[PDB]
Design an enzyme around this catalytic site. Structure first.
Site, mmCIF file in Angstrom:
data_model
loop_
_atom_site.group_PDB
_atom_site.id
_atom_site.type_symbol
_atom_site.label_atom_id
_atom_site.label_comp_id
_atom_site.label_asym_id
_atom_site.label_seq_id
_atom_site.Cartn_x
_atom_site.Cartn_y
_atom_site.Cartn_z
ATOM 1 N N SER A 29 11.331 -8.244 6.905
ATOM 2 C CA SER A 29 11.016 -9.256 5.873
ATOM 3 C C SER A 29 9.520 -9.809 6.054
ATOM 4 C CB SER A 29 11.676 -10.676 5.972
ATOM 5 O OG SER A 29 13.030 -10.463 5.515
ATOM 6 N N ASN A 63 17.027 -5.014 8.442
ATOM 7 C CA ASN A 63 16.815 -5.362 10.239
ATOM 8 C C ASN A 63 18.220 -4.831 10.895
ATOM 9 O OD1 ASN A 63 14.568 -6.717 9.246
ATOM 10 N ND2 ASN A 63 15.357 -8.684 9.640
ATOM 11 N N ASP A 82 12.209 -13.947 -3.552
ATOM 12 C CA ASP A 82 12.859 -14.506 -2.350
ATOM 13 C C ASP A 82 13.437 -15.674 -2.492
ATOM 14 O OD1 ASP A 82 12.496 -15.018 0.493
ATOM 15 O OD2 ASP A 82 11.394 -13.339 0.904
ATOM 16 N N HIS A 120 12.246 -18.971 4.207
ATOM 17 C CA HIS A 120 12.118 -17.914 4.131
ATOM 18 C C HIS A 120 11.069 -17.206 3.190
ATOM 19 C CE1 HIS A 120 13.079 -13.288 3.599
ATOM 20 N NE2 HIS A 120 13.274 -13.415 5.084
#
Ligand code: NA
Length: 266
Positions: A212, A146, A32, A64
């Site tokens: 996520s 998403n 990530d 994130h």
């Protein structure tokens, strides 16, 4: 003070914790935006950065990855996290960076890979990397995406779209699919992904919503299962996650349902 996702209890992780299974000795690569290892509540065992302009995977300029990582720990507090930075500060990354990070995780013998990331186009090389990681025995988990819905079209993004990957949608605390959760036959299971409180850079916490956030709960799940059953393969880990879910609505929207780690670990 601090916080922990409501999702940890929703997926039945506390039962395992209470039984002494917390993910100890399981290596989870968080592919990530890096992980801020300075966070008092996060311990990062190793990692690597593949973002040419950001050489430190232990620094997370986007937040994130730190949040995501915080969720894996929340679910599997004793896991060994690997910060594998394939996303730059703006939250974006080359498919090549991502492959590189996947390769790194195989080479470094990670037990589980969490990919709270995705893009709309497939790549054979990305497919190949996830496929090889699974063949190598790693449990590969990814956000479903998403993207909402688009008719009857699948909106699952890659790599979550590859059958070797466990693509995770998100539900809220009531088990309702989140409006943004990608859908399609490739969706495998759901996990809490709305307003999930987690660690943020700078000894902070905060909430985020997204597949996520769902993903790390399943990555943590795998970790707990592995800590109880250190010899099970990824195949077994995966099948048990999939076969013990709590059925919710239709597959197209919910996959096989919500993960139930307590049941999964047998
Ligand atoms: Na999939």
């Amino acid at each position: 003070a601090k916080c922990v996702s409501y999702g940890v209890s929703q997926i039945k992780a506390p039962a395992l914790h209470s039984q002494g299974y917390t993910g100890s000795n399981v290596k989870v690569a968080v592919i990530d935006s890096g992980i801020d290892s300075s966070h008092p509540d996060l311990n990062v065992a190793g990692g690597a950065s593949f973002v040419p302009s950001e050489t430190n995977p232990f620094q997370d300029n986007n937040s994130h990855g730190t949040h995501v990582a915080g969720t894996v720990l929340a679910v599997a507090p004793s896991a060994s996290l690997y910060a594998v930075k394939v996303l730059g500060a703006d939250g974006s990354g080359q498919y090549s960076w991502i492959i590189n990070g996947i390769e790194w995780a195989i080479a470094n013998n990670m037990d589980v890979i969490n990919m709270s990331l995705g893009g709309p186009s497939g790549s054979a090389a990305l497919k190949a990397a996830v496929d090889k990681a699974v063949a190598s025995g790693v449990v590969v988990v990814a956000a479903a995406g998403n993207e909402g819905t688009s008719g009857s079209s699948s909106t699952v993004g890659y790599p979550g779209k590859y059958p070797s990957v466990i693509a995770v949608g998100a539900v809220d605390s009531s088990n309702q699919r989140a409006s943004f959760s990608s859908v399609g036959p490739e969706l495998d299971v759901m996990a809490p992904g709305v307003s999930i409180c987690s660690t943020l850079p700078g000894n902070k916490y905060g909430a985020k919503s997204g597949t996520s956030m769902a993903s790390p709960h399943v990555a943590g799940a795998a970790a707990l299962i592995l800590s109880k059953h250190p010899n099970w393969t990824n195949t077994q880990v995966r099948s048990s996650l999939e076969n013990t879910t709590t059925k919710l609505g239709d597959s197209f929207y919910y996959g096989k349902g919500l993960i139930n780690v307590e049941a999964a670990a047998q």
